[PDB]
Each structure stands twice: as C-alpha cells, then as structure tokens.
Nucleic acid binder design. Structure first.
Ligand SMILES: N[C@@H]1[C@@H](O)[C@H](O)[C@@H](COP(=O)(O)O)O[C@@H]1O
Ligand SMILES: [Mg+2]
Ligand SMILES: [Mg+2]
Ligand SMILES: [Mg+2]
Ligand SMILES: [Mg+2]
Length: 90
RNA sequence: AAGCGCCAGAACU
RNA sequence: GGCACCAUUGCACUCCGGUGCCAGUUGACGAGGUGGGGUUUAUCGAGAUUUCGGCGGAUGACUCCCGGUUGUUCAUCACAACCGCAAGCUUUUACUUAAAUCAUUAAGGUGACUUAGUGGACAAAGGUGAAAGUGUGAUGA
C-alpha cells in the first residue's frame, strides 16, 4: 500500500552518504517536497535509501516515473515503504 | 616563550 | 573520515561486518631555571582514559676547571663551607598574579576534535628583601 516514504535499493554502495543524499535530492525533488532523505552505509542498510515525501501523491509519481532509472550506473528499484517514517507519524 | 617541539606505536574519527 | 579487495540486494528512523592501505585527530597544566669542559635516566608541584609510547630539544644534577664571595680591618698562603655578576650555617618572616583540570557558552570541523571567551578555586620547589642566633688559623701594617 502507498506511503509517504519510498524505499530505494540497488543503489551503488561505493557512493558516500553526503553525495548519495544530494544526488537523490537532485533527481527526486521535482515530484514534491522532500522532508528528509535517510541513508546509511552499514552492512544491513548499504545500497538503500528512504525518501520521505510530504505528500503521498508525490511518492507515487516518484516510484512510478523513476522505477529502474540508471543512477550511478545501476538501475534503482523503488518500493512503497513497509511502515511510515516516524517523523511522518508524529 | 622550553612541561618545550614534533608524531612513526597506541587509541579515537 | 577516505580508497581497494572480500563479503552483503539488505525495510530503516541512539550510531554498529572483516582485512589491508592512506588520511586526519589526541599526544605537558603552569612555577622555576644558562661562566666553560665532561658525564648523565634534567628541577617543582597541579591534574588524573595517553601528562601513555617514540623522537628531538633543554637553563637541571654531579664532577673538573677558571673567576669570585663569606669565615669582622686590610693585603699573602693554605684551611672550612658557598657563588657564576650571586656568594658560611641554624632558625623563623612576607613577597614571588599559578595555569590547566573543574564548571559554563560561542565559533570552526562530516567527525575525532580545535580555537576563544566567561566563572570560581586550590600548589610545590627555588628564589628575593627584611628579623633573632651560632662559623677559622699562619705570617705582616
Ligand atoms: N622540564 C621537563 C623535564 O623535567 C623533563 O625531564 C624533560 C623530558 O621529559 P620526558 O622525558 O617526559 O619527555 O622535559 C622537560 O624539559
Ligand atoms: Mg604547557
Ligand atoms: Mg612557564
Ligand atoms: Mg612523553
Ligand atoms: Mg626523553
């Protein structure tokens, strides 16, 4: 079911936190207001990102339009996030 | 304006 | 913090795989101190994760040398203890802005941390200027 946060994986894990953040912002801010982008390079979480849209409608067009889009040489996979970001529940 | 300077170990990022 | 490799396709919201290599960062808080040669593990305390470990300095210490003080004028020689522009020993007296830690709040840095301000303390050694005692003989004016 649709969500404010879209889950992105298959991201190039050689890209550092700061850069991948901004690049993601560069690519995804046309869909709507991005509240935060969450990114970590740990064993569990590397190659993955959470983009938190203010409006779900924006998240939907994001997932739809950028699905499989080559980014740092790898086509990204995008999913509606399992749970809400706590910052969206708050 | 000399318990002062440096930084190869160590620890920390 | 960064890079290569190995491994990882992983659904999170206080960071969080391993190895190697590079980078960065921490690494002494003040007080005190220099005649020359030598030797050597270079004085005082405050603090308390490294103020540890390594390297390099260094005014210390001991000893030798040289030049001087005191041992009641004043030379000369030894003797006893000192001094390096000070100067026997006992033995009281004030002076010699401690600084950091600690607390606190700004700036910078991705970060480890860094710089600076603010607040209040608390030393020891050595030294310096007073004060009371108790330290030579030989020869010559
Ligand atoms: N004042 C100190 C000395 O007392 C100390 O001996 C010397 C070497 O210190 P360390 O051996 O700890 O490096 O440094 C300073 O000069
Ligand atoms: Mg210092
Ligand atoms: Mg000093
Ligand atoms: Mg040391
Ligand atoms: Mg040393």
């Amino acid at each position: 079911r649709p969500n404010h946060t879209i889950y992105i994986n298959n991201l190039n894990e050689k890209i550092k936190k700061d850069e991948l953040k901004k690049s993601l912002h560069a690519i995804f801010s046309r869909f709507g207001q991005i509240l935060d982008i969450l990114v970590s390079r740990s064993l569990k979480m590397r190659g993955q990102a959470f983009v938190i849209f203010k409006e779900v409608s924006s998240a939907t067009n994001a997932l739809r339009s950028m699905q499989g889009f080559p980014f740092y040489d790898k086509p990204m996979r995008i999913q509606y996030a399992k749970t809400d970001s706590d910052i969206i529940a708050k």
